[PDB]
Every structure is written in C-alpha cells, then in structure tokens.
C-alpha cells in the first residue's frame, strides 16, 4: 500500500510488524514529508507506520532543507533518500507532513532555514491539499499563517497527557470521550491567541497539555502540538539519554508505571494515533482531493 525509496531502513523495520512497504513503480495519494527531526530514520518509521494503516495506496516523498547543519542523522542517508524544494516546486501533493524540530527556543526568524521553510509553507498553501504540521512545525505554521506567537513554558512538557475533543471533526471519528497523546516541548501556543482568529478552530486539547490540535475550517491546514507518532519507548530513550549525560530532569509524566523508569511504559496513545492518521487520509484527503 505505501511506497517509499528503495533502501529505506523503514522497509525492513516495518516488515517485522506485518507492514509491508514497497519500492516499485483511483490513483495513489502523493504524500510529502518534510523531515526536520534530528533522528530522521526514527521519525520516518513512526510516520510511515501510520500512513500505511489503510487500504489506500500512498506514495511518499521525503524532503529536506538545502541548509544542513549536521545534527544526529549521518549525511549519507540524507544524500541518498532526500530531495529538495526545487525538485518538487512543480508537483502537486494530496498531503504534506512537516515534522517537529528541536528549535522551539529561538525566535522563528532566527532559525537557520526559516526563509526556506517560509517559501515551502507558502507553496503548500497552493500545491498541497491538506498540510499537517507537527510539534515545532505547528508553531511555525500557526505563526507564519495566522500571526500566532509561541511562549516559553516554566518547564518542559514531557509525558503522555489526557485529552478531550473540543470541536467535532472527521479527524476524531472513532474516538472515545478521552484519549492520550505524547507531548515533548519547551514552548506552547495559547487558546487565547488562537481564539482571536476565526479561520482557526481548536479540535482537541488537554487540561495538563493545553492546545493539542487546531485546524483551518477546510482542514487543509492541521496543526498538531504533540507527538502522537512516538513509540512506546521514545520518551524513555530521551530520558535515559539525558540522565546518562548527568542532567537532572523530570521523569516523563503519566508514562512509567508508578513513575518507575526501569518498569516498562504502558502504550496508551496508539489507538488515537492510528485513528487520527487514517481519518486524515480517508476523510481530509481522499474524499476531498
């Protein structure tokens, strides 16, 4: 069902979970991913897992900035699998995901590649049917399209938080009254700013985590502040990493049994993640363009 570049690590990883990606030649959906994460291989796997759960054919195209300051991912992988804005200016896509980045703490305009991002964002307004913006990207987009500013939090929001649906959307078909989603970020946007923009609507939120999903009335722009796509272990690995660097930090919230980091975490947000991305593909894209 989902099609991806030939040697992508995700193929063999996902193959282990019954998810058989492919690498060969109604029409398939064209889904673009602008991967801004530091661990690009992990994020690929997490997103591809959810784009594949479906009977629709998806073709995935992996995009990067021409500005590369080497973070985690090695240069070879980006060179092999990733393309630039220039090679896709001229195409149109049914969907587009712009992922998080570890960049919350700078003003938007003082990010290396804000100007590139801006051109791409603007382009997606016209060449992508529905664009989804995750984590810091939600903030970048809410800011660039609607003037919605971000704010530093007293401390880091890191854990799994409980949410409710604030406004009906097809995106939340199949949801229970309450669901869980991970958040991991040092900044936030606010109901009170968003509330001043009629084009925007708050679809889900959390008392602990705040605004979670906001969207256009047409749902051609969807802003997600958390990380529904994270693995059971994602937060744990981050925790063990920081602790191993002798940094003192909070145990992620509502994640570890009894808040015990040796005791393995309980997976509570898979259902939401899967429903959410299926609905996007089926309801926000396939049945609309």
């Amino acid at each position: 069902p989902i099609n991806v570049p030939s040697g992508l690590p995700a193929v063999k990883v996902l193959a282990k979970e019954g998810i058989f990606v492919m690498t060969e030649k109604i029409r398939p959906l064209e889904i673009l991913i602008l991967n801004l994460m530091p661990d690009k291989i992990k994020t690929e796997i997490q997103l591809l897992r959810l784009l594949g759960n479906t009977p629709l054919q998806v073709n995935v195209t992996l995009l990067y900035t021409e500005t590369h300051k080497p973070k985690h991912t090695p240069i070879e992988h980006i060179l092999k699998f990733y393309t630039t804005f220039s090679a896709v200016k001229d195409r149109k896509f049914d969907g587009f995901i712009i992922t998080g980045a570890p960049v919350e703490l700078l003003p938007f305009e003082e990010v290396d590649y804000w100007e590139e991002l801006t051109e791409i964002m603007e382009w997606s307004r016209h060449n992508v049917y529905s664009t989804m913006f995750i984590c810091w990207a939600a903030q970048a987009g809410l800011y660039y399209f609607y003037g919605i500013p971000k704010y530093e939090l007293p401390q880091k929001l890191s854990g799994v938080y409980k949410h409710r649906v604030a406004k009906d959307s097809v995106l939340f078909r199949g949801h229970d009254d309450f669901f869980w989603a991970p958040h991991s970020r040092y900044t936030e946007v606010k109901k009170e700013d968003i509330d001043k923009v009629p084009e925007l609507e708050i679809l889900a939120e959390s008392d602990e985590a705040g605004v979670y999903v906001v969207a256009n009335k047409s749902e051609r722009q969807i802003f997600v502040t958390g990380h529904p796509e994270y693995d059971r272990y994602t937060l744990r690995d981050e925790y063990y990493r920081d602790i191993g660097r002798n940094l003192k930090v909070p145990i992620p919230a509502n994640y570890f049994p009894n808040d015990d980091p040796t005791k393995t975490p309980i997976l509570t947000w898979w259902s939401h993640a899967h429903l959410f991305f299926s609905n996007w593909l089926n309801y926000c894209i396939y049945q609309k363009t």
Copy 2:
C-alpha cells in the same frame, strides 16, 4: 461509501453524524448481515456505523430467518428491508456478520431456527470470505464448527470490561496495551475447551470478561463474544428498562460514573470498535478476497 436499502432508518440517523449512507446503483465489498437481534433497527445503525468508517465501498445486504416469532421489531420493517437465505444461496460475499440474539439459555438444537442457521453457517464456509459471529452467534458458530460448548454463568455479565491482546492479529493493529469492550450475556465459552482445538486461536481476552475474540488461522471465521458495536447508552437503556419492570438487577459494571445511573456513561470502547471493524474490512477482507 456504504450502500443500503432505500428507506432504512439508519440513513437519516447516520446522516446526523456525518456518515452519509447511500441508496443508488476495484469493486465494492459485498457485506451480508444476518440480523438476529430483537431490536433490528438499532443493531443496523450500530453495525453500519462501523462498516462505513473506511474509504472502501461497501454494499450491505440484510438477511433474516424464514422463522419469525415476533419479538420487538415490527413485521413491516422486516418485510420491507430483509431477504431470505434462498435469495442469496447463489451469491458470494466478501464478508458476513451474524449478530447476537437473546437465546443463550436454550440448548443450541432447541432454538426455533437452529436448522436454518446451520444451513446458512455451512454455506458461509464456502460462499463468504470472512464471517464474523457476535454474541450468541459466536457461541452458535464455535459450537457448530468446532464442538465448543457454552456454559451458564453464575450471574449475568453486563458492563464494559478491560481487555488485552492475547495473540497478534491484523485485527488489532492500532490497539493500545489495554482496551475496553461491552459484554452482555448469561453464558460463556472457555479457554480450556478452545485450547483443545488447534484451528482456533484466542486473539483477545479479559480477566473479568473471559474469552473475547477467537479466530480461524485464516481469519475467515472470527468469533466475538461481546458487543463492541453498542452505543454509549445501550447498556443504560437496558438497565432503565429492567428496573422499570420492577426487576432487581446489577448496575452494569464499569459503565456509570461512580456506579450512578443518572450520571451519564463515559464512552471508552469506541476506539477499539472502530479500529477493529476497519481492520477486518481492510486486512481480513480487502487485501485477501
């Protein structure tokens, strides 16, 4: 997406939840429903809700026994919308749902229409790709195909119960470690009987509710002992009904806030229900026949 008979009440009901059924003329999936419930209109709505959540086209055919002893549903509705085994012997279907019935307390062979049911069940072995059997039907089928007997429970199992996945299946893609499903029945089948039949596998179970989902190795037969398709209110209406008949009975388990029947119930099993029926349609049927 989902197609159904012209005047079905479900059309207008589901239309209220954005689910636009249809009534006109890859090919559509042919899904047969043998509705044995006493409230046939309710069950239609509950099942159609979950068969429709999908990008695949489904055509639904509503089947009944030629034996009718009038329960709840009026004769006019059955006469208008329902057809008999004879009119469908000759067709083949991709999927088939056989629903519950209020019949647990009789031996199988002393049910009015066991012999009709038996002929239909046998037929589905050959003319239906994947057959799903719910509530009492799970028991009828487990019994008829594998010799698996049912047992009376000390008291009635009535509530929402927590479950785990016991064996991996595509049916449970997107599930959390633990999920909820309603059960409402006076009888049960047992791990210990099922365990003696290699063709069977237990896919989900509950410590409180017991065996929940069992299946063929090919998943061409799926047995569900609970009612994932129930509305928020289904258990409440049953409760108010029985209490109004001055019958003393248990408050349904894990359903009412604080076990208070005026306080409205919290919907906790929608996610599971939706994932489960999507997976059936996508993974157990569409990608196989």
